[PDB]
């Protein structure tokens, strides 16, 4: 019995699904023998939503699109776990900047992370999340590795993010130690370091949350880190 997974694309860009598929070596075995992708028209010819063990929900949801809202509601009913797949679903990401007014739907204006409308069980922030974190998450769910997954469960509550979080949650709190991990991680290169402190280029920030996610001073998963190092 393979885990039944749905991949539901709302107002996303499909980059998250693409990242999943850049687990090149294992992809054929993953799709054919490890999990069962049972729903999501990007991948499956099925127009009646089935029960799922896990829904990977990509994209924010548009408050002015009735079908998106119904689809989100239905997948919450039919999936045991809902994962906000990528920062648009998890934090709104760059759709936080949408403000409507464009053809051919000038009223399409308002986009929110999915937890603003439904209960979310875990999250994978990232724009997109790395092929590695996606593979490790799926394997963990396969093997019931709940110790590994705890940060994903916790991150379900991180739904409004910005590079300024490094100030408000780290530097302001007396926690920053100038390591540069945040600047290493930022997928848009919005971050530099000035005199050992993060420097935000707001013109490049997509509000994805990854800098604060990777900061060693936001949360420190010591036991899992040592386990993997054999220490």
């Amino acid at each position: 019995a393979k885990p039944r997974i749905g991949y539901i694309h709302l107002s996303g860009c499909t980059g998250d699904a693409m990242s999943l598929t850049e687990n090149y070596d294992i992809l054929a075995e993953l799709l054919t023998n490890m999990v069962d992708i049972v729903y999501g028209q990007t991948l499956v010819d099925l127009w009646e939503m089935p029960e799922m063990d896990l829904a990977l929900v990509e994209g924010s949801v548009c408050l002015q699109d009735e079908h998106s809202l119904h689809e989100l509601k239905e997948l919450r009913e039919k999936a045991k776990l809902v994962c906000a797949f990528g920062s648009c679903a998890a934090t709104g990401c760059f759709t936080r900047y949408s403000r409507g007014g464009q053809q051919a739907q000038p009223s399409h204006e308002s986009f929110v992370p999915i937890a603003d409308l439904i209960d979310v069980d875990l999250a994978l922030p990232g724009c997109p999340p790395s092929p590695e974190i996606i593979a490790k998450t799926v394997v963990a769910l396969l093997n019931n590795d709940m110790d590994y997954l705890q940060p994903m469960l916790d991150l379900a509550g991180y739904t409004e993010a910005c590079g300024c979080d490094l100030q408000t949650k780290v530097v302001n709190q007396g926690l920053c130690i100038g390591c540069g991990t945040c600047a290493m991680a930022c997928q848009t290169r919005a971050l530099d370091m000035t005199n050992g402190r993060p420097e935000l280029n707001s013109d490049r920030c997509i509000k994805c949350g990854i800098c604060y996610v990777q900061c060693p001073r936001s949360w420190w998963p010591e036991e899992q880190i040592k386990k993997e190092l054999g220490l």
Binding site: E22, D45, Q64, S68
Partner: protein
Amino acid sequence: SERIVISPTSRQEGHAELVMEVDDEGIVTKGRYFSITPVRGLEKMVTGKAPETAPVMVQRICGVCPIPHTLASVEAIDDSLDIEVPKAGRLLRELTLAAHHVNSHAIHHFLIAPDFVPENLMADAINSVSEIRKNAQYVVDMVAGEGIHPSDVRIGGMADNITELARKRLYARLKQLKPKVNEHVELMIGLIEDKGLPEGLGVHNQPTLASHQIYGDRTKFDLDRFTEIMPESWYDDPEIAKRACSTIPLYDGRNVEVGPRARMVEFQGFKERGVVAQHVARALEMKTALSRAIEILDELDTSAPVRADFDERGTGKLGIGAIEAPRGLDVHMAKVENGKIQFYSALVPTTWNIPTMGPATEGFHHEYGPHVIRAYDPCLSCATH
């Protein structure tokens, strides 16, 4: 007549609806395809903002093809700012797109594999696609910063050049990939032909629009020929016209086809038309794209500048970025003045193709309709932006 509705159409990027009116025998007499993807509204998002913001945001139109949006954006802005990009930066931009074509066409083979690849060959096909994408994406990661939403395509060129280590590593991997891509293309073309789709399926009389064989050329996009209208003056069913989420760009007052077949027709003397031709052109273009990337890596001077200095205030000049995305001509237009984006418009390949796709299902059984759609490799987040 009876209405067959497929919503959303499957194994493509993003959500569209196909509506086919069919006669007693199930033959399509009237076909309409339209976006039902919500409008995230990238054009109106980047209007009013700093120029550096636009490439970052518009590449997130689509995570299947972010490379050509980043390129069209910086080319439009370069053009608005009268920037001359240094030779090595132009080559790295071209190399990034050439590698990207290989990746993207391989992604389409993945999506259409259920239609064309026998069950006993399916594992092999996924593994073939994956090895090809792995090698293509080494280029996009090393040169452009990230393999999805590359960070280092920039106004004025690229963020940085690459090392000799990088250049020679990429060269060897792409050249050694040639026989694999040749074998894959041969295999895919044979399978597409083996499906036995009816003769003439998807053949239409619309223009083929293409600016260049493999990168792009703003001098071939003629604003005296381009117009843009809205679904309300295109679709003749008012409920559909109100639901449709993408605009309707036209050339010489007519709807067109863009993409690999269009480029092959306009630049490589390709004479085949319709669904099978579209797949065949796309597969053959993998040869073109990989060969070009290999040659650029051979030519590249890793010690040379890749980025021009520039004054970002602007003069109110309309800048055009015309890029041949894997799915077709991707035009971004940008006007910079007072250091802000005063105007922005994107005419993305699937945006062009959508008005052509519905009617191209007509004349054959509606069960062929979805195959007509996938031949365009449609991308609805792209179409809608």
